Amino acid sequence: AMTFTRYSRLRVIAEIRNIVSSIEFDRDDELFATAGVSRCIKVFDFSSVVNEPQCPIVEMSTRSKLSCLSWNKHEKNHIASSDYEGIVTVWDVTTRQSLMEYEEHEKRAWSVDFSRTEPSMLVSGSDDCKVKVWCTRQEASVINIDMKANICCVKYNPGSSNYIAVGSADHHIHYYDLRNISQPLHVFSGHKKAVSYVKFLSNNELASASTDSTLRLWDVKDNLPVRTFRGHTNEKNFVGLTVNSEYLACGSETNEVYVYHKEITRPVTSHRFGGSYFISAVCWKSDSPTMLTANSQGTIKVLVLAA
Amino acid sequence: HFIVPDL
Numbered sequence A: 001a002m003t004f005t006r007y008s009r010l011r012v013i014a015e016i017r018n019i020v021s022s023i024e025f026d027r028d029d030e031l032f033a034t035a036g037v038s039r040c041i042k043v044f045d046f047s048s049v050v051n052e053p054q055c056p057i058v059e060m061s062t063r064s065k066l067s068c069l070s071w072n073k074h075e076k077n078h079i080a081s082s083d084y085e086g087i088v089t090v091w092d093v094t095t096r097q098s099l100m101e102y103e104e105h106e107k108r109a110w111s112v113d114f115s116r117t118e119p120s121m122l123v124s125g126s127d128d129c130k131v132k133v134w135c136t137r138q139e140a141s142v143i144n145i146d147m148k149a150n151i152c153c154v155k156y157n158p159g160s161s162n163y164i165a166v167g168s169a170d171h172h173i174h175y176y177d178l179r180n181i182s183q184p185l186h187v188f189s190g191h192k193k194a195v196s197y198v199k200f201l202s203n204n205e206l207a208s209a210s211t212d213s214t215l216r217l218w219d220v221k222d223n224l225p226v227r228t229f230r231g232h233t234n235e236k237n238f239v240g241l242t243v244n245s246e247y248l249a250c251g252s253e254t255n256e257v258y259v260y261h262k263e264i265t266r267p268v269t270s271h272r273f274g275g276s277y278f279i280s281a282v283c284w285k286s287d288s289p290t291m292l293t294a295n296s297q298g299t300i301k302v303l304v305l306a307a
Numbered sequence B: 001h002f003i004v005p006d007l
Helices: A047-050
Strands: A009-016 A020-025 A031-036 A039-043 A060-063 A066-071 A078-081 A088-091 A098-104 A109-114 A121-126 A130-135 A143-147 A149-156 A163-168 A173-177 A186-188 A195-200 A205-209 A214-219 A225-230 A241-243 A245-250 A254-260 A269-272 A279-282 A290-295 A300-306
Touching: A009 A269, A020 A290, A031 A066, A031 A279, A031 A300, A039 A047, A039 A241, A047 A300, A078 A109, A088 A121, A098 A130, A121 A149, A130 A149, A130 A163, A163 A195, A163 A205, A173 A241, A195 A241, A205 A241, A241 A279, A245 A279, A254 A279
Parallel strands: A020 A066, A020 A279, A066 A109, A109 A149, A149 A195
Antiparallel strands: A009 A300, A020 A031, A031 A039, A039 A060, A066 A078, A078 A088, A088 A098, A109 A121, A121 A130, A130 A143, A149 A163, A163 A173, A173 A186, A195 A205, A205 A214, A214 A225, A241 A245, A245 A254, A254 A269, A279 A290, A290 A300
């Protein structure tokens, strides 16, 4: 542990005082956005939040509760949302307008992700058991994958828009090459409950979270299990997962944020937010020790790993 | 609620 980590705690550097299901930084880690049950996407300036004692710079009202946000990796001002009606919307945060409203899903969509390398491409997953790939220049889905169970999370590989990880209520991660969707490249078994999040640390390193109270690390080059992380409590809710090159962070039903170094199976540190509440969203500020977090009361905290 | 589907 000593060899890999130099941190022992998380410091609170800001707090903005109603579940927040998603908290995400824009392309430049300059703005961040929150969304959830209140049917409003709120955008904040990170530096203002850190420096000052708090008001969003943009708010966009929605027709449905929001489950996930994903900022565009090329168009700074564009952000996608998924909602409880199944609608996947692309918004412009400067004009406040919906640019695209994709309505093919028949049930709640739990997740949306904009590709980093082909930034007009976005993927969504839904309780309707479908994965849909969309292009911002086309109204109809480009790819549709019919699966056997509810899809809880979708994520593009950070190095290529040809690969997506799909976390399913069937307990497995289905890893697809979108150039041939007749069969996944590989299906990763190991979780004992639904897979609620999938996030990549790098081109070849995939992390997942599950309501079996574990995170897991997987090698998508050689299709291997790597490591299981334990300590947090997650038996029921979407509690958030975020990863960077070295660290994984997740929420807990004990109203605590947990941090793991990818080489160590038990936590580096944890933070009690302050059972009755659960952490509901987390997001690293790229490869830095700074993180955004939010809980089921709608409180937002900026945390920083510290010695 | 934000309960993860299972079964």
